[PDB]
Paper text:
The reabsorption process of urate in the kidney by the urate transporter URAT1 plays a pivotal role in controlling serum urate levels. URAT1 (SLC22A12) is a member of the SLC22 major facilitator superfamily transporters. The cryo-EM structures show that hURAT1 has the common architecture of SLC22 family transporters, which is formed by the N-terminal domain (NTD) with an extracellular protrusion and the C-terminal domain (CTD). Structural comparison between different conformations of hURAT1 reveals the rocker-switch-like mechanism for urate transport.
Benzbromarone is a high-affinity hURAT1 inhibitor, which was clinically used for the treatment of gout. We determined the structure of hURAT1 in complex with benzbromarone to a resolution of 3.0 Å. In the presence of benzbromarone, the structure exhibits an inward-facing conformation, in which the extracellular vestibule is sealed and the intracellular vestibule is open. Benzbromarone binds at the urate-binding site. The ethyl-benzofuran group of benzbromarone is surrounded by C32, S35, M36, F241, and H245 of the NTD, and F360, F364, and F365 of the CTD. The dibromo-hydroxyphenyl group of benzbromarone forms hydrophobic interactions with F449. Moreover, the side chains of Q473 and N237 form polar interactions with the hydroxyl group and bromine atom of benzbromarone, respectively. In contrast, the N237A, F360T, and F364Y mutants maintained urate uptake activity similar to hURAT1WT, but all reduced the potency of benzbromarone to varying degrees. Notably, F360T had the most pronounced effect, highlighting the critical role of F360 in benzbromarone’s potency. Specifically, benzbromarone clashes with the side chain of F449 of the CTD, and verinurad clashes with R447 of the CTD of hURAT1 in the outward-facing conformation.
Author numbering: 3 to 57, 66 to 81, 85 to 95, 112 to 305, 315 to 324, 335 to 517
The structure:
């Protein structure tokens, strides 16, 4: 089929336009994923005290004689002004930064604090389900078709979540949104790979990753503009209506059409792509998980690659989804994640050729994990150092993702390569699901979630030294 790609052009105006459009879509998809740390940012909250909120003393004195001291206690109040009782009358939140939030809306604080990470997990669960369902669908129905329907579902579910009346409805529609983002991601990747020459595959993968890198800054900018969770979610999910509208101009994969037997439709598609070669030419021109697991020589490589994918997913979605614990200024941290991923991913791609492939991946994972451990080790007062170290850790885990994406392909033969990549992606999605869950260990101590997030990638990088090349 590569001969047909060369005949049409392989790389050119069409490929660059498609890559730019899909990169914008991926930027908005990253905004959808990472919006939760702005639309669910826990504000400073305290029990609604009658004396503070009437239903002469300075406000400090009133807050001292109404709310007991805490590690001011955020979920207890004195029975009478100065015996403590829970927030009988509800909570009062600090709206200096964020005017509204899901935490502030459904009181996902203390007794129900777990509902905040749990919701995130549900979102990250949907992706794992979406990849499971949108995977075969793209192989049964067109890849561009599944991409278009994924865009539509993302837009609709994002709007519905932005207008969710109760918490379960919000969780359900975020699950549906994740189900759709899984399809968007998979079909964007497949469409990029299936329209560019085999030489440029690492380049297109790196550009796809830079899509998320830019999406980080896009999320920061949009959150800075919009401080209301409803309006934030609505604004983030609105552009997917336009994505759905213009996805019809994307060229469906000619490889898929030719392989499945749509010779005439694929011929028309590839002629259209070449414009921006008789049917006989195309006619002449044109590995289950059990097999991969059964081979005894690939057990170690399979396990180590899967562990690396899982480490990336777990660490990245356990850290990037809670940036308030990593630093102080959440908007600046969100910007810095992308601003460091760009150079980090470029440098990873650079060292993937001269320093090696296994050493680069191992060094990236070890640096990310050690930066996370140092961030949880340094004093809390030294906030700038903690923020910088967390930014470096996220940059390192992104670089490790680039390394593993470009590396796990070569680790397996041309026949088991797709199966190994799919297994790695599923492991990464499962790790992402587990990511937010381990934040529930923060009750035992805020240091423990970061200890886990640091000791996972460090161990994965240590085990990545056992790979062949
Ligand atoms: C570059 C890694 C990354 O950065 C993000 C920012 C916001 C939301 C999701 C991501 C995200 C992914 O989940 C991801 C997971 C797999 Br597996 C891939 O093959 C690709 Br491509 C991207």
């Amino acid at each position: 089929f590569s001969e047909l790609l060369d005949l049409v052009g392989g790389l050119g105006r069409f490929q660059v336009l498609q890559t730019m459009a899909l990169m914008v879509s991926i930027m908005w998809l990253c905004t959808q994923s990472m919006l939760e740390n702005f639309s669910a940012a826990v504000p400073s909250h305290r029990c609604w005290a009658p004396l503070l909120d009437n239903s002469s003393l300075s406000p400090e004195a009133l807050l001292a004689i109404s709310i007991p001291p805490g590690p001011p206690h955020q979920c207890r109040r004195f029975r009478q002004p100065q015996d403590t009782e829970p927030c009988v009358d509800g909570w009062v939140y600090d709206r200096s930064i964020f005017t509204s939030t899901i935490v502030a809306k459904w009181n996902l604080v203390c007794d129900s604090h777990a509902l905040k990470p749990m919701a995130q997990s549900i979102y990250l669960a949907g992706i794992l389900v979406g990849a499971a369902v949108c995977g075969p669908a793209s192989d049964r129905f067109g890849r561009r078709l599944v991409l278009t329907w994924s865009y539509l579902q993302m837009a609709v579910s994002g709007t519905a979540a932005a207008f969710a009346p109760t918490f379960p409805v919000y969780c359900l529609f975020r699950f549906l949104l994740a189900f759709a983002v899984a399809g968007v991601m998979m079909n964007t990747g497949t469409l990029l790979m299936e329209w560019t020459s085999a030489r440029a595959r690492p380049l297109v993968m790196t550009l796809n990753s830079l899509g998320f890198s830019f999406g980080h800054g896009l999320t920061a900018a949009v959150a800075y503009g919009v401080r209301d969770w409803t309006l934030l979610q609505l604004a983030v999910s609105v552009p997917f209506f336009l994505c759905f509208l213009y996805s019809w101009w994307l060229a469906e994969s000619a490889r898929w059409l030719l392989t499945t037997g749509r010779l005439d439709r694929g011929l028309q598609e590839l002629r259209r792509v070449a414009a921006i070669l008789t049917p006989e030419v195309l006619l002449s021109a044109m590995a289950s998980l059990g097999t991969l697991l059964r081979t005894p020589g690939l057990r170690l490589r399979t396990c180590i690659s899967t562990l690396c994918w899982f480490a990336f997913g777990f660490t990245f979605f356990g850290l990037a989804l809670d940036l308030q614990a990593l630093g102080s200024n959440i908007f600046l941290l969100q910007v810095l994640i992308g601003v460091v991923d760009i150079p980090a991913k470029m440098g990873a791609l650079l060292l993937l050729s001269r320093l090696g492939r296994r050493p680069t991946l191992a060094a990236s994972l070890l640096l990310a994990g050690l930066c996370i451990l140092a961030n949880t080790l340094v004093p809390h007062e030294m906030g700038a150092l903690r923020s910088a170290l967390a930014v470096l850790g996220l940059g390192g885990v992104g670089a490790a993702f680039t390394c593993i994406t470009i590396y796990s392909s070569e680790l397996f033969p041309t026949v088991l390569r797709m199966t190994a990549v799919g297994l790695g992606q599923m492991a990464a999605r499962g790790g992402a699901i587990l990511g937010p869950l381990v934040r529930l260990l923060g009750v035992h101590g805020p240091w423990l979630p970061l200890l886990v997030y640091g000791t996972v990638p460090v161990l994965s990088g240590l085990a990545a030294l056992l790979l062949p090349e």
